[PDB]
Design a protein around this ligand. Sequence first.
Ligand SMILES: [Zn+2]
Lengths: 167, 147, 69, 304, 100, 134
Amino acid sequence: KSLQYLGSYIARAKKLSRTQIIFVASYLTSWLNRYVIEREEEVDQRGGMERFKHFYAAFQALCYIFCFRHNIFRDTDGNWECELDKFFQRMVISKFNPLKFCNENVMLMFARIAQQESVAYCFSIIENNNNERTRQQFIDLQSYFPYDPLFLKNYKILMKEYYIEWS
Amino acid sequence: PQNENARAEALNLANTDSQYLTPTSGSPVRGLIQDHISAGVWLTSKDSFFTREQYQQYIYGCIRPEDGHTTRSKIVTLPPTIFKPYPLWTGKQIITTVLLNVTPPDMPGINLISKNKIKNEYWGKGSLENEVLFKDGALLCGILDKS
Amino acid sequence: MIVPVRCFSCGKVVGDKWESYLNLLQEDELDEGTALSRLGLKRYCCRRMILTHVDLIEKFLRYNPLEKR
Amino acid sequence: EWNVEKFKKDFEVNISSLDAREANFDLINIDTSIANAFRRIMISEVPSVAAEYVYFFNNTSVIQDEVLAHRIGLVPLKVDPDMLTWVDSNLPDDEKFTDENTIVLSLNVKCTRNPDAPSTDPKELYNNAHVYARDLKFEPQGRQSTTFADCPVVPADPDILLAKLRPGQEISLKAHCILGIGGDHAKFSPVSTASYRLLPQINILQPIKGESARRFQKCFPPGVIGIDEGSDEAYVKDARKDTVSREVLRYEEFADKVKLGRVRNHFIFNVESAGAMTPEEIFFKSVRILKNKAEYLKNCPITQ
Amino acid sequence: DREKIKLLTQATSEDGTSASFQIVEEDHTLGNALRYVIMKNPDVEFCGYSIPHPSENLLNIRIQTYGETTAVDALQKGLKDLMDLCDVVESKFTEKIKSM
Amino acid sequence: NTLFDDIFQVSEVDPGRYNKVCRIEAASTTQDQCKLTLDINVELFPVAAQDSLTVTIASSLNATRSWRPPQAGDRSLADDYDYVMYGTAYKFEEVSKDLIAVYYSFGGLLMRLEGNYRNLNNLKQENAYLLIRR
Ligand SMILES: [Zn+2]
């Protein structure tokens, strides 16, 4: 939850030092390098997949920034931010399948922008998901996102200030 | 137990694993002694011969690997005894593979030599099946009974 | 007491035979067996339900508080 | 290799003696595995219709209103299913018992004293003395009145001794009717008995001609053992005209001259009901939902 | 209605050669009928049924198979043939009931 | 490959008051001391007094994992032969000199093999197929 407090604390606002958002949270992108160097020699040992609640959420929370701010995810020159052609490409067919145990709403917004902006390729994997695919109430903590859209009509007086619509 | 520290000990000291051999003489009092053992006579003897469909159903009603009783990847069985347009099986073969599909590997089978209460003069003449023997843990001769 | 509708294990409703049985032993001058066996009784777990039945409403229909005596 | 037309010419059907009550039924070339999936879906997983909810008003008799309550629901109802759909279970009874759900039934008998001259017989002594099944009557509530114009939903056997009365007492009740499978109650078994019997395979080994021919036939049922002459060896002539009673094994000389086994691929059935259903009706109720048992299973999205 | 098929993955492999299938509320009406046709599939090396508790209605079956045949695909052709195991006692049988 | 090869003679038959099993004694037709003991299964192979057996104990059939069910057009060395057994060897013994007798079973199915010429090719085995003729 604490790194899920980084999901809509970055996305749905307007006043952010966005040169620092990649910079201060670079340790979480350095986590994604640390998670693949030192911590992919342990899966065939005693245990299942759910040791790593840190992995289906903070990677999801940075991909919760993905579908909302695509004009931030491009620079002036023409390349990708931190070489998106390899960074979100190396984590496909590993020992966790991060396109297998996912969310419904935001983790199936992964279908529009991944093809038309040429981000990733997962369209021949969605059919392959639902063949192989406590813990029964483990979904209760991994379904709620903290800073959801606002429903009231007279506190929106204060908070339509730094809150933008879908684009 | 209305605490938790008595869940520690009553799962681990009053448990049925640790009261097999009773400390009164060393004569054990635990086991199926009424119906599953007079039906042990009519299972493993040679007057109870089994087909593939009997041998297959009679272990999956025992193991139930969804609860977890396999140890290598899954369940396996033995080759059939008789090779013929129907492979027969044996009740001696029945007790073996259930005694095989639960023990983890890196572990040799067990070897018993013991007796029964059947006294082969009631199996006719000259056929010796009062005597049990577990080569690699398999009822390789004799009919299991009370003893 | 009262005839059990749809006998214990058989599944046949052996009650229409009961008054029909009582008409046999009364005036028709029939036996106990083939009188009972001339009724559509294929099995023998039906056969007791009229061979045995005691008809003991009679000691409950002779104590009536809803009429005098 | 398995092939279905390597079972089509295998699977053989004969029909021995069919009525609307009993159907002797030579269903041949099938396994004892399938001698339950057509035996059990005849007996308890087949849609039957009987009364369940008994809205009493008054029960004045000496017969106490527990035991009589599950007898007016227990009665065989001469009513055809697929005229009445399934019933919702846990909503309140307003949208639970519509006209589509309930065959609204009612019973009302008020007996009295009749003066008469005299072992004085009770029907000869009282009006309305012995309430039977034919006093139970039908009255619709809702949006059907024409679907039972062709058949009023009569109780299947009108002679059922529901209660016997004495003057002063009376009875007036109103039970409600519903579907149901026999796994719930035995009242929802639309067959009395659907048990099976294999074909007995009697064996001979020697000719029994001579004086055993008048001894191989006394103890057996007479229409089984066809003695032919003193010669032309006596073939046992009728197989299924015989139970497996093996009384010949009590003899000490027909212990090896003759054997007996069973053909495990040759079945006779005996399906009979209380009148509500017929054996000429229910084969497309044990099959046609077992047919719909299987195809529902295949097209279901696999989970977890 | 996703209470019927349930891949109980706590007895499976990676590529799913075998799997303990979880289906609810049935009884011998499948296990003593689908096992009779699962062995008719020639790429079947083990199968059988089981009861999780005899009082309440619940089942659990498991199949085994050789290569180029998964777990759930051997349940396909098993239940494609129960669709025809009762069809023969309709298609051919409608003749014999017609002309008794 | 074959490890044992001869022709035997059924001496006497007794039921044991079993159902599908009768005990068979088997001397040989080529060496007057080899006395095989046979608990035959009677229904796949009807035995009688003084039949003409051919009791051959090979080991294998030309990785070989386990019992595949017998598929169409295979190559078994036991294709030509019918009552094919499978078992292990568990106990040797000793009789008079230059004779080495074994005990041998097939799921509670006793053998006893007096003889000599099996002391150079046979031993306490695990996988042997009994390729019987007739
Ligand atoms: Zn009966």
